[PDB]
Design a protein around this ligand. Structure first.
Ligand SMILES: CNC(=O)c1sc(N2C[C@H]3C[C@]2(CNC(=O)c2c[nH]c4ncc(Cl)cc24)C3)nc1C(F)(F)F
Length: 269
């Protein structure tokens, strides 16, 4: 039964606050903060973790976390669990526990690769491998009919073995139909994926250079799309362009995109 399966997922997702130690702030936004932490594991040893801090909304957070914790794919970030701490003002402070990624987010990695002390120049073959990794994570989520809604290179994390995983599930990433009638589908995530592939191929450029966020709906409506990057194969550009076809039904699925990206990668020496 669907209910008993949700009750199990809820029991599995909560981490006792005594098993966690909070460290330094890694990042701090408006919606919350990211801190380093230590999680005491079942095997009696501690693991370095990243801790993100934000009745109905609490239950909704828990239910959503219970679903994400259930995800099991190498290209999807693992949710280790959640804690609910209470602020001095009696305001709930939900915390989400994730593996710590020393390499950080993909967008920052890309930008650092263009600096001397940062990682070395990323070869085309490795940039394509990052695209395959994200398509695999998205294929997993779309098959489970789970919408990401904020896919961008900044929301992709690099693991220690250089595997990319999708995480955190922005006008220049939003599909033409979601700007026009609030409609959001799996084909809208395919559009954001095309935009993300373009960010990887330009090594971190902000999409639509020279175009202002308020000019975006008019720009797309008139048929304009992201331009081909200088260091990008024609085969790759066609793939990212197929993500931005006006009619969402004409856009390929993540499965189709993944296979095209894998084939192009295999074709490279
Ligand atoms: C220069 N990079 C940054 O400032 C970024 S980007 C980012 N995120 C992108 C998306 C929102 C998300 C929050 N973090 C995680 O979910 C992490 C899981 N595991 C990690 N291990 C390390 C780190 Cl740094 C982060 C995480 C995923 N968070 C930072 C942070 F933490 F520094 F504030």
């Amino acid at each position: 039964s669907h209910m008993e399966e949700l009750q199990n997922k809820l029991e599995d997702v909560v981490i006792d606050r005594n098993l966690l130690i909070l460290g330094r702030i890694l990042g701090e936004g408006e919606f919350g903060s990211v801190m380093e932490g230590n999680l005491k594991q079942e095997d009696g040893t501690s693991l370095k973790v990243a801790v993100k801090t934000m009745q109905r909304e609490i239950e909704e957070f828990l239910s959503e976390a219970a679903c994400m914790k259930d995800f099991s794919h190498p290209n999807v970030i693992r949710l280790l669990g959640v804690c609910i701490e209470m602020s001095s003002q009696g305001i709930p402070k939900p915390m989400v526990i994730l593996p710590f990624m020393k390499y950080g987010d993909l967008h920052t990695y890309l930008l650092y690769s263009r600096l001397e002390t940062g990682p070395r120049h990323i070869p085309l073959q490795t940039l394509l491998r990052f695209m395959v990794d994200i398509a695999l994570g998205m294929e997993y989520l779309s098959n489970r009919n789970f919408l990401h809604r904020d896919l961008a290179a900044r929301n992709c994390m690099l693991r220690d073995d250089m595997t990319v995983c999708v995480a955190d599930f922005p006008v220049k990433w939003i599909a033409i139909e979601s700007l026009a009638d609030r409609v959001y589908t799996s084909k809208s995530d395919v559009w954001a994926f095309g935009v993300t592939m373009w960010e990887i191929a330009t090594r971190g450029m902000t999409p639509y250079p020279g175009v202002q966020n308020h000019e975006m709906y008019d720009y797309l409506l008139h048929g304009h799309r992201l331009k081909q990057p200088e260091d990008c194969l024609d085969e790759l550009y066609e793939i990212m362009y197929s993500c931005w076809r006006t009619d969402p039904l004409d856009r390929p699925t993540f499965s189709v995109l993944r296979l095209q990206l894998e084939r192009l990668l295999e074709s490279l020496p």
